[PDB]
Amino acid sequence: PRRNIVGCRISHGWKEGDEPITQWKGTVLDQVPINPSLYLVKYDGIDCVYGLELHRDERVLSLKILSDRVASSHISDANLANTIIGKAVEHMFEGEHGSKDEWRGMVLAQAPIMKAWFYITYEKDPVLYMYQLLDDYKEGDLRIMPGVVDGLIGKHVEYTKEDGSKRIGMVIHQVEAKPSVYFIKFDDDFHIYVYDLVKKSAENLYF
């Protein structure tokens, strides 16, 4: 057997290519039921969710369970959370050259474990991010804007590259609040990709 790490704080070194070798800290959100070697992790200070085979990936150095802080959190106002979950939004970020940019996105769910945080993805950056979005909302930085397939979990998928060959992956989750939206893990990357099968931006997905 092995110890559970879901819901735990973790730390490990990270050695990739010739990149500087660093020590990472984060929180394990999820052990993917359909592929239990795969864990979803929220790393401290890093916005995008990571999907890593934490016990198999050679880049992971000496995985440790931490006890530095409570891992979990909960939502202040669940009713308020329910008004943004499942909604298309404009999510404001600071612009590169001043002002703020409206990033079009979709609030997907409250995250597991870190329940004060929300899963969100973006039209221009369709991977999985996590923020404490009720903070954005209170500050005026989150504005609400005024293809379901059964049995997809675990299905292999390929995506057409501009280079011409196929990007290979697996469907790992279906979003409850918007069941035409799925999470995909591709073999070549740690991001969790989010696709809405009702959208033309998904026509490129082959099952």
């Binding site: 890093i46 404001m92 970020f93 600071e94 703020k100 923020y131 954005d136 930085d141």
Partner: peptide, 8 residues
């Protein structure tokens, strides 16, 4: 608002 992170 938040600052967008660089890719790491």
């Amino acid at each position: 608002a938040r600052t967008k992170q660089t890719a790491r």
